[PDB]
């Protein structure tokens, strides 16, 4: 999607997280500590998109994401489009695939899980199923619907 009003300049080498379903942008930036870098960053919050009404967009420079770091966006911005860029050209363009493992960012719902009081990173096996994603904690081995885990 373009903007015949005010378009944000491109860059040589970096990545572009387009189609961010607005009000998920900043979250992506929090959850994944995307701002904990010196590289040039450019955010676009709540913007015009003919293919979904409104959408956020993040641009990080001299920084790329493996197919996995991109898959990690799955649960938040599934229809996003990660754009690999170099010499001002969109040399790469991948979409978030549901990963088989999600680490560090989720918090286990089980208040009795050992993960809470301890110096370890949360970790969940991802399993897709009709209507939701089943997430099973590495520690307590309990499985929860992603709506419960992501549940604010």
């Amino acid at each position: 999607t373009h903007d015949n009003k005010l378009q944000v300049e491109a860059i040589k080498r970096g990545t572009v997280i387009d189609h961010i379903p607005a009000q998920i942008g900043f979250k992506l930036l929090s959850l994944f500590k995307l701002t904990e870098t010196d590289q040039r960053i450019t955010i676009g919050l709540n913007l015009p998109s003919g293919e979904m009404g409104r959408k956020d967009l993040i641009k990080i420079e001299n920084t790329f994401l493996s197919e996995d770091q991109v898959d990690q966006l799955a649960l938040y911005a599934p229809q996003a489009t990660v754009n690999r860029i170099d010499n001002y050209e969109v040399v790469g363009k991948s979409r978030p695939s549901l990963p088989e493992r999600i680490d560090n960012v989720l918090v286990c719902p089980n208040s009795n899980c050992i993960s809470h009081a301890e110096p370890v990173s949360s970790s969940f096996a991802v399993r897709k199923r009709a209507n939701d994603i089943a997430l099973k904690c590495k520690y307590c081995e309990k499985e929860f619907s992603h709506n419960v885990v992501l549940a604010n």
């Binding site: 089980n110 009795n112 899980c113 050992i114 993960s115 009081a117 301890e118 110096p119 370890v120 904690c137 590495k138 520690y139 307590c140 081995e141 309990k142 499985e143």
Partner: protein, 310 residues
């Protein structure tokens, strides 16, 4: 080296059918041929962050039967290594620089798994972690079934009591589900039914199971009648009374039981098995407990010795 050498034993979901047969084969050998010196010079930590006398005595005895020394503690109203402040991670990083293996029981799910991330090369054996796993109880149960039935395939297994909350029956069902042609009978108050996730696992592997109001309906065909304790403290006094009645086993109920049939119970029992059942040839709950010794010895030997000339 054997397949279980230096491996952590945390969950039944991590053990394969061959792992299980390997543990039970080693158990029968140690039972028939004791190696009281196999682990001499090995020091093992018996860490019961959660007190559990029956399990600890069983596990410590197994340790001594192989010749190992033991150091440890129970509960945390006495202990000064985590009572309020120090992480379980630090407690393990310390203890693992002293001992050759850690046996531990803990109130929170996942504690044994967290321990393996901080014990370096020291094997961690889970003696129970909250409502999640209790793998050695499952190994002892399976050793007892295999030993009294001669197989782990094509058995009629009935489970009675609190199937909802018993971590022990969930585990045994998962373990048995690794073998073929087993059929399950679940007898429990609707309030304590075997959880849907276990039933899903079963349907998924084409394993037959069916619910029944009384043991009476399955007695003629049962090979193993596995009784569980009803977590009364969870229910209502009036409620617990209203149903307990149909999940209590009496000697007269064994009237049409097969000759090979065995009654198991991880213990303690109290209101689920009347004392008159104790004298019948079917009562095998105390023999089941004595087998925890051979199951736990096997697990220690396999994990601490590369090759067992058993």
């Amino acid at each position: 080296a054997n397949p279980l050498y230096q491996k952590h034993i945390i969950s039944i979901n991590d053990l394969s059918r061959d792992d299980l047969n390997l543990v039970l084969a080693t158990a029968a050998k140690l039972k028939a041929n004791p190696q009281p010196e196999l682990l001499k010079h090995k020091v093992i930590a018996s860490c019961f962050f959660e007190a559990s006398t029956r399990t600890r005595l069983s596990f410590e005895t197994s340790m001594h039967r192989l010749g190992a020394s033991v150091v440890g503690f129970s509960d945390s109203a006495n202990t000064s290594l985590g009572k309020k402040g120090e992480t379980l991670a630090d407690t393990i990083s310390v203890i693992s620089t002293y001992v050759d293996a850690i046996v531990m029981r803990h109130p929170q799910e996942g504690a044994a798994r967290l321990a393996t991330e901080f014990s370096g090369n020291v094997p961690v054996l889970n003696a129970g972690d909250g409502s999640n796993q209790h793998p050695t109880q499952t190994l002892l149960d399976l050793f007892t079934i295999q030993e009294t039935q001669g197989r782990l395939d094509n058995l009629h297994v009935a489970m009675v009591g609190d199937l909802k909350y018993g971590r022990t029956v969930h585990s045994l069902t998962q373990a048995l589900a690794k073998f073929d042609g087993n059929r399950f009978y679940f007898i429990a108050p609707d309030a304590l039914a075997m959880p849907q996730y276990i039933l899903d696992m079963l349907d998924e592997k084409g394993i037959a199971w069916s619910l029944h109001s009384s043991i009476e309906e399955v007695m003629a065909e049962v090979d193993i009648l596995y009784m569980t304790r009803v977590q009364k403290e969870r229910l209502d006094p009036s409620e617990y009374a209203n149903v307990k009645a149909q999940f209590v086993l009496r000697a007269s109920d064994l009237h049409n039981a097969k000759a090979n049939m065995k009654v198991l119970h991880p213990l303690p029992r109290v209101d689920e098995i009347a004392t008159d059942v104790d004298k019948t040839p079917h009562a095998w709950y105390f023999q089941q407990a004595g087998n925890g010794i051979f199951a736990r010895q096997a697990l220690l030997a396999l994990v601490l010795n590369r090759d067992l000339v058993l």
